[PDB]
From a paper:
Here, we devise geometrical principles for de novo designing single-chain immunoglobulin dimers, as a tunable two-domain architecture that optimizes biophysical properties through more favorable dimer interfaces. Here, we devise principles for de novo designing single-chain Ig dimers with interfaces diverging from Fvs, as a two-domain Ig architecture that is hard to find in nature and optimizes folding stability. We envisioned that de novo single-chain Ig dimers could be designed through two-layer edge-to-edge dimeric interfaces, resulting in extended Ig β-sandwiches. Key to such robustness is the two-layer edge-to-edge strand pairing at the interface between Ig domains, which involves a high number of backbone-backbone hydrogen bonds and protects oligomerization-prone β-sheet edges from solvent; overall favoring monomeric stability and solubility.
As the seventh (C-terminal) β-strand of each domain was found to be partly disordered and not present in the crystallographic dimer interface, we reasoned that the C-terminal region could be removed and then generated single-chain dimers of 6-stranded Ig monomers connected by a short β-hairpin loop; overall building a 12-stranded β-sandwich (right). To this aim, we removed the last nine residues of each domain, and designed a short loop connection (between 2 and 5 amino acids) between different anchoring residues (W68 or G69 of one monomer with G1 or R2 of the other monomer) by Rosetta fragment-based insertion. We found that the gap could be easily bridged with minimal backbone strain with loops of two or more residues connecting G69 with G1. The design with a two-residue hairpin loop ([name]) was also found to have a strongly funneled energy landscape by Rosetta ab initio constrained folding simulations. We selected [name] for experimental characterization and, as the three scIg14 designs, was found to be well-expressed in [name], soluble, and monomeric by SEC-MALS. It had a far-UV circular dichroism spectra characteristic of all-β proteins and was stable at 95 °C or 7 M GdnCl. We succeeded in solving a crystal structure of [name] at 2.8 Å resolution by molecular replacement using the design model, and was found in excellent agreement with the computational model across the 12 β-strands (Cα-RMSD of 0.8 Å). A minor deviation was observed in the conformation of the designed connection. At the bottom, the designed linker is surrounded by a tightly packed area stabilized by aromatic stacking, and at the top it was found a cavity binding a glycerol molecule (as crystallization component) that is surrounded by the two β-arch helices (insets). The robustness of the [name] scaffold was borne out by nearly identical crystal structures obtained in the absence and presence of a 15-residue binding-loop insertion.
Residue numbers in the entry: 0 to 140
Write the structure that this text describes.
C-alpha cells in the first residue's frame, strides 16, 4: 500500500500547497504555479506546506504537481480552473496503477489510472468558490 495527500488552499493572493506522505517511501513533489517552480522532498510521515504568492490570482489558475518517487515513478496532476468547472488531468508514468481521489466541497471523485494512462476529472460548480480548498489523494496498490 501507500498514500500521498495534496491539499491546495486559496486565500486571496496566496496559494498554499500541503503535502502529506502516508507511504513507506520518500517522494519528491515538483510544483509549478505559473512562472514559479518549487521542488520538495516529503519523507514518510512528513507534512510539507509550500506557499505561493501572486499579483494576479489568475497566475494560480493552472497549478501542476508531479509526485515523483525513487525508481522512476511519476504521477502528474495538472489542475485547470476554467469558468464554473475544475478540470484535473492525471497521468501515471509508473509501473503500478494508482487510485486518485479528488474532493471539492460536497463532491468527491475517484478514478483508477493504469500505468502509461492519462485520465481527466472535471467537477462543475455554480459558485467557483466551491474550489477554494481542493484535496487529492494518490494511493498505490
Amino acid at each position: 500500500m501507500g498514500r500521498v495527500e495534496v491539499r491546495v488552499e486559496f486565500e486571496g493572493d496566496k496559494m498554499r500547497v500541503r503535502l502529506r506522505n502516508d507511504s513507506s517511501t520518500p517522494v519528491e513533489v515538483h510544483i509549478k504555479v505559473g512562472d514559479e517552480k518549487r521542488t520538495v522532498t516529503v519523507n514518510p510521515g512528513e507534512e510539507v506546506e509550500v506557499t505561493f504568492s501572486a499579483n494576479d490570482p489568475h497566475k494560480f489558475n493552472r497549478p501542476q504537481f508531479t509526485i515523483e518517487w525513487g525508481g522512476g515513478g511519476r504521477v502528474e496532476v495538472r489542475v485547470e480552473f476554467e469558468g464554473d468547472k475544475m478540470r484535473v488531468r492525471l497521468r501515471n508514468d509508473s509501473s503500478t496503477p494508482v487510485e486518485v481521489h479528488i474532493k471539492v466541497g460536497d463532491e468527491k471523485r475517484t478514478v483508477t489510472v493504469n500505468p502509461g494512462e492519462e485520465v481527466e476529472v472535471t467537477f462543475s460548480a455554480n459558485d467557483p468558490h466551491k474550489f477554494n480548498r481542493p484535496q487529492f489523494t494518490i494511493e498505490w496498490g
